[PDB]
UniProtKB/Swiss-Prot annotation:
Changing residue 117 to V/W: Almost complete loss of mono-ADP-ribosylhydrolase activity. It comes from Chikungunya virus (strain S27-African prototype) (CHIKV). ADP-D-ribose binds at residues 13, 27, 35, 115-117. Phosphorylated by host on serines and threonines. In the N-terminus, the macro domain displays a mono-ADP-ribosylhydrolase activity. The central part called, the alphavirus unique domain (AUD) has a zinc-binding function. The C-terminus region, also called hypervariable domain (HVD), is mainly disordered and binds several host proteins. This intrinsically disordered domain contains 2 SH3 domain-binding sites and 2 FGDF motifs necessary and sufficient for the formation of nsP3/G3BP complexes. This is Non-structural protein 3. Changing residue 36 to E/F: Almost complete loss of mono-ADP-ribosylhydrolase activity. Residues 4-163 form the Macro domain. It is a peripheral membrane protein. It is found in: Host cytoplasmic vesicle membrane. Seems to be essential for minus-strand RNAs and subgenomic 26S mRNAs synthesis. Displays mono-ADP-ribosylhydrolase activity. ADP-ribosylation is a post-translational modification that controls various processes of the host cell and the virus probably needs to revert it for optimal viral replication. Binds proteins of G3BP family and sequesters them into the viral RNA replication complexes thereby inhibiting the formation of host stress granules on viral mRNAs. Interacts with mRNA-capping enzyme nsP1. Interacts (via C-terminus) with host G3BP1; this interaction inhibits the formation of host stress granules on viral mRNAs and the nsp3-G3BP1 complexes bind viral RNAs and probably orchestrate the assembly of viral replication complexes. Interacts (via C-terminus) with host G3BP2; this interaction inhibits the formation of host stress granules on viral mRNAs and the nsp3-G3BP2 complexes bind viral RNAs and probably orchestrate the assembly of viral replication complexes. Interacts (via C-terminus) with host NAP1L1. The chain holds residues 1334 to 1493 of 2474 of the full protein.
Length: 163
């Protein structure tokens, strides 16, 4: 684990991360998809061999020796608010188990279910709080990746508030 486990946020493409492993915001079928998923497919295509996994779960596939943790958050257009919230919390819990199993000292993670799976809603706080709930008991350095300037500021404020 990291000597002083921390959270940081960066506004840039997660495919250029400087961490020991990456979390993909995957679809259940292991398809190239859009957004973060498509960038992950371009950078680590080999990690999509047998990466299909149900909603609410995470499945790790190696690209060489670099781990890609495919985490499947719910599409809020299909799920009710309550069941979608439960699946979103479950996907992050499975990410924490995989990061721990891998023994990595750092992990790059996007906010699950905040893009095309958001159902047209702003889910920054909902997704980030589930990320904290799952990752707080791990000792890896967590680096959250985002693309919007306003979201970078809000995620940074949420991280600083707890320190
Ligand atoms: Cl970039
Ligand atoms: Cl999404
Ligand atoms: Cl964003």
């Amino acid at each position: 684990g990291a000597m002083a486990p921390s959270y940081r946020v960066k506004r840039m493409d997660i495919a250029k991360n400087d961490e020991e492993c990456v979390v993909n915001a995957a679809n259940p079928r292991g398809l190239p998809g859009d957004g973060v998923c498509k960038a992950v497919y371009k950078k680590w295509p080999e990690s999509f061999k047998n990466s299909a996994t149900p909603v609410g779960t995470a499945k790790t596939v190696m690209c060489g020796t670099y781990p890609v943790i495919h985490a499947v958050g719910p599409n809020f257009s299909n799920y009710t608010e309550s069941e979608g919230d439960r699946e979103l919390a479950a996907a992050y819990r499975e990410v924490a188990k995989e990061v721990t199993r891998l023994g990595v000292n750092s992990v790059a993670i996007p906010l699950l279910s905040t893009g095309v799976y958001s159902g047209g809603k702003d889910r920054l706080t909902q997704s980030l709080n589930h990320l904290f709930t799952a990752m707080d008991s791990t000792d890896a350095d967590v680096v959250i990746y985002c693309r919007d300037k306003e979201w970078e500021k809000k995620i940074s404020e949420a991280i600083q508030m707890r320190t």
